[PDB]
Design a protein around this ligand. Structure first.
Ligand code: B12
Ligand code: SF4
Ligand SMILES: [Ca+2]
Ligand SMILES: [Ca+2]
Length: 417
């Protein structure tokens, strides 16, 4: 009857949509990678291009949702789909089914085309009470799953669409809902779990005073009592939203890793990214994490528009001084609908490091050169230095090249080239 399709991976959003359709009373299948109505969950912009042919060849009533829906014009440009639902879609799939079985222009967040242009409705927020996800029988073959704990983020990172997709107010799920969902996923075969939904430490937070360390500690404790502490992680932590109690809870109830989003060591680029942090904040957060005996990983973004060699040098200096336990390096991705996407869509190739000339012609661009250089230097920066070999060098080269290709493709898609 109804089939929910998601490429490459079993995403939490696809499982949630399938579970909502199941609770509504429909016969639902959740497959990775046909029916009368097909709900298509797309998580990356490049999915609009990589799977254009097979999606346009799917029979039946096709409905597309997910993060890519934040730019419905791009989706409808690449995909001849009956309906696109923007934003949260828990309370929208029933009306979409009634449309497939009701006028599509009456669904909040709906977006479709017609011989006289586009009909694009305003999206709306959903209640945090919703159906259990449909867990496929082979979820153990998939960390295994990202559990959403809260929705929305007060941040303003130009490279993130969460504040625009889910809102700027933190809406925390009921703790018992999270516990029951984790219990069900564990019964179904899932063994490794990651928190998700906005920055990690803002669960149970308030609009008036923000961080609630006791709520975060309680969340971590109650989840670890179901999963085991070694099987739980928290992936996105802001350096300005940590306390000693938060770090103690991470140490006692998770695998002991704190994943900071540092992005850059240049104060100028940090201001341009609207991260709301400065290098001193990162240094203090790493020091406080070390004092509580945590493992520390840091996420960095290279190739941001306007980043000259001075900014990259400052980022490398900071990364060396931090001596983190692990480093992750990514090339800036201009997500459509974000401030970074708006800035890159009008940026000429001579000003975009993804299309700027590198000093070494072995690299396809300056951004790939900086990415590979950072990735290589990280193995001599980290607290446990790894002797660089030819195999690791080739692996880093391949990773930088793959990131360069992905970013080039999504940038050319953003500019409608
Ligand atoms: C965990 C995670 C991952 C997982 C994948 C799981 C997943 N994609 O869900 C991993 C770690 C593998 C990953 C990798 C990447 N990720 Co990621 N990831 C996330 C993260 C943090 C949480 C996703 C989640 O579970 N959300 C909670 C659920 C409930 O929300 P949801 O999935 O959006 O679903 C809701 C709505 O979209 C809607 N909905 C969803 N599907 C459908 C379908 C239909 C038919 C309908 C009607 C409605 C509907 O209803 C749901 C409930 O409201 C999000 C950020 C975020 N907080 O959303 C980024 C995010 C999805 N990732 C992003 C990025 C940049 C990437 C990478 C490309 C990074 C890279 N360069 O390597 C890769 C590749 C992704 C890919 N699949 O190709 C972007 C996507 C931007 C875009 N438009 O392309 C996001 C939004 C973050 C960001 N702004 O930077 N990611
Ligand atoms: S803090 Fe994390 S979730 Fe919030 S806007 Fe920045 S990157 Fe997105
Ligand atoms: Ca307990
Ligand atoms: Ca200090």
């Amino acid at each position: 009857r109804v089939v929910v399709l998601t490429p490459e991976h079993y995403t939490y959003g696809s499982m949630l949509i399938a579970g909502v359709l199941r609770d509504l009373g429909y016969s639902v299948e959740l497959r990775k990678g046909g029916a009368d109505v097909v709900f298509i969950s797309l998580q990356s912009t490049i999915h609009l291009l990589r799977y254009r042919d097979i999606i346009n060849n799917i029979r039946g009533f096709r409905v597309v949702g997910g993060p890519v829906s934040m730019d419905p014009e791009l989706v409808l440009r690449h995909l001849d789909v009956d309906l696109v639902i923007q934003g949260e879609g828990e309370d929208k799939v029933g009306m979409a089914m009634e449309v497939a079985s009701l006028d599509a222009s009456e669904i909040p967040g709906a977006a479709f085309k017609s011989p006289e242009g586009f009909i694009i409705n305003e999206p709306a927020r959903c209640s945090m009470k919703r159906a259990l996800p449909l867990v496929p029988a082979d979820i153990s073959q998939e960390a295994s799953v990202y559990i959403e704990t809260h929705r929305g983020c007060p941040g303003n990172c130009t490279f993130c669409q969460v504040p625009e997709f889910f809102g700027r107010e933190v809406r925390s799920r009921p703790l018992e809902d999270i516990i029951r969902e984790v219990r069900e996923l564990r019964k179904s075969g899932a063994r490794r779990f990651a928190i998700s939904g906005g920055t990690g430490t803002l669960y149970g937070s308030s609009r008036f005073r923000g961080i609630d360390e006791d709520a975060f500690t309680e969340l971590l404790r109650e989840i670890s009592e179901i999963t085991g502490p070694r099987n739980l992680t928290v992936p996105d932590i802001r350096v300005d939203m940590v306390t000693p109690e938060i770090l103690d809870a991470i140490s006692e109830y998770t695998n002991g890793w704190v994943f900071y989003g540092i992005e850059s060591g240049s104060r100028r680029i940090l201001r341009r990214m609207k991260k709301g942090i400065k290098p001193g904040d990162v240094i203090e957060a790493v020091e406080l994490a070390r004092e509580h005996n945590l493992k520390v990983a840091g996420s960095f973004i290279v190739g941001y528009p306007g980043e000259d060699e001075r900014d990259h040098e400052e980022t490398l200096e900071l990364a060396d001084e931090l001596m983190l336990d692990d480093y992750f390096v990514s090339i800036a991705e201009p997500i459509p609908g974000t401030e970074l996407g708006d800035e890159v869509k009008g940026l000429e190739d001579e000003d975009n490091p993804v299309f700027m000339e590198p000093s070494d012609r072995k690299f396809r661009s300056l951004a790939e050169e900086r990415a590979f250089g950072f990735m290589l230097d990280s193995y001599v920066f980290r607290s446990m230095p790894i002797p660089v070999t030819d195999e690791l060098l080739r692996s880093l080269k391949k990773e930088a090249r793959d990131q360069q290709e992905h970013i080039e493709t999504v940038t050319r898609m953003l500019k409608r080239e």
